[PDB]
Amino acid sequence: TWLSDFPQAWAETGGMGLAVRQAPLIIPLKATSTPVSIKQYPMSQEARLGIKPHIQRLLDQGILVPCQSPWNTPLLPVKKPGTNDYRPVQDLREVNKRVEDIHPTVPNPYNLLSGLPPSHQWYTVLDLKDAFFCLRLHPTSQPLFAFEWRDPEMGISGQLTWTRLPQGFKNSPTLFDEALHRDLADFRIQHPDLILLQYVDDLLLAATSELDCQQGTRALLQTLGNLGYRASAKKAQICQKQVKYLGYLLKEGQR
Amino acid sequence: TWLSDFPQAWAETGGMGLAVRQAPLIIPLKATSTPVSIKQYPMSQEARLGIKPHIQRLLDQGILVPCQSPWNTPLLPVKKPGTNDYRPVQDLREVNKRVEDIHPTVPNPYNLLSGLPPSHQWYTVLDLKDAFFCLRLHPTSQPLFAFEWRDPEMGISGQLTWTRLPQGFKNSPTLFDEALHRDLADFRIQHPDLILLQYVDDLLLAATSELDCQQGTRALLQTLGNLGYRASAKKAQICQKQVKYLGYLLKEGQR
DNA sequence: CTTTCATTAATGAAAG
DNA sequence: CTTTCATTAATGAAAG
DSSP: OHHHHOTTTBHHHHOSOOOTTSOOBOOOBOTTOOOOBOOOOOOOHHHHHHHHHHHHHHHHTTSEEEEOOSOBOOEEEEESSSSOOEEEEEOOHHHHTTBOOOOOOOOOHHHHHHTOOSSOOEEEEEEBTTTGGGSBBOGGGSGGGOEEOOOTTSOOOSEEEESBOOTTOTTHHHHHHHHHHHHTHHHHHHOTTOEEEEETTEEEEEESSHHHHHHHHHHHHHHHHHHTOOBOTTTOEEEESEEEETTEEEETTBO | OHHHHOTTTBHHHHOSOOOTTSOOBOOOBOTTOOOOBOOOOOOOHHHHHHHHHHHHHHHHTTSEEEEOOSOBOOEEEEESSSSOOEEEEEOOHHHHTTBOOOOOOOOOHHHHHHTOOSSOOEEEEEEBTTTGGGSBBOGGGSGGGOEEOOOTTSOOOSEEEESBOOTTOTTHHHHHHHHHHHHTHHHHHHOTTOEEEEETTEEEEEESSHHHHHHHHHHHHHHHHHHTOOBOTTTOEEEESEEEETTEEEETTBO
């Protein structure tokens, strides 16, 4: 039972994450950038009702806060099913165009896997839950991601924005990847024989024996939980000799 | 009066040309070629009536002869005006595809002109009339260019074909250019100081003085007429210091 | 809903 | 009139 031995590490038990060792992020704008305020496209009541619960939860979690800002981007009503359960999707393309570019450091999967020796065949795969939301956004960079939220009868005054790294921001993957690398630097040092692959929120721990993987996984989950990250208990693939990672089937050190 | 001093050289006085020194041409087919017989698209009486006179003249001139051949290509009703005066245009693309390719030796105008010294500034431009028709076609290669000719009430039995190099045949320009080069080789030798440019049927004689151009032009016209070629008396540009050639305005050795 | 890049489908020009 | 290459105009896929 891992779900029990590591309360903090699992999203199902530790609650929403928060990377306590990471300074709130400041997002640099391009030299000539000026605020852009895109109007919110009218939203059908159905779309709005499907989205409402997610927005209320984020507000409850403090991931969204009311605000008044010169920046504004459209929120989009996106449903994966045939016509059920919506989810908010923000179009941040106009903001992305105004944010200074950074060097893409996230390695492509193929290259990331090459760094996997045939020796280590005991794998553990972890999927960090709501990775981006774990990184705080400095108050100065928060107004940048504002959007309008209407609640007819009575609700929010108008705009809401993120206090965490959001979905849709071009630099989120890279910023998260680098942040987690900084938080796990020590762990890599205390476990020289282990092999840890990081692909944004997708982690692969590789050990030589089942015992090392056991203790390796315990130490990792332990560290992640203490750092404020949360792994998905449901998706977790523990000490298997065969696992699914980045769209690959790892078996006998193949692929 | 040149129109008078050189009866044979002008199309207007010497009649249809015939390159007497040139052996009738044999057209080699590609190794795998087999005869293709494309049906004649129905022709409106108007188109047919507009074309008839040209066909009768060619038959009278012996440029077209009746024939029975496994080859056949469509004749096209083409009128340049708004809707008047037609002219026969044969679609020889299927025949062209079956004829063995030869090396394109006709030089592009730009390069042909480069070979023009600033010294020679007295020009004579000649346009050979019905150049292709001046080259005979060997009887063996004649069936290849057959087409159908209908004359309702009563006329030709069915097919007609050319006894001369025809329009529409991909190799005509090159074959004509090389043939005329062979016929004018001696003339170039007897007139070392003259500069003769050949672009298929467009000729440019360049001399140093007006007198050389006078005698140069007389000798050329004389030779052309004796060889069986015919220059256009109407278009002829004699011993001018400025002339139009290949879409260029030659003046003071410019362009 | 808008934006940007692909892939496919129409027309227009050149020719024999 | 049919063929082949261009240029332009429609749609379809990917995304935020």
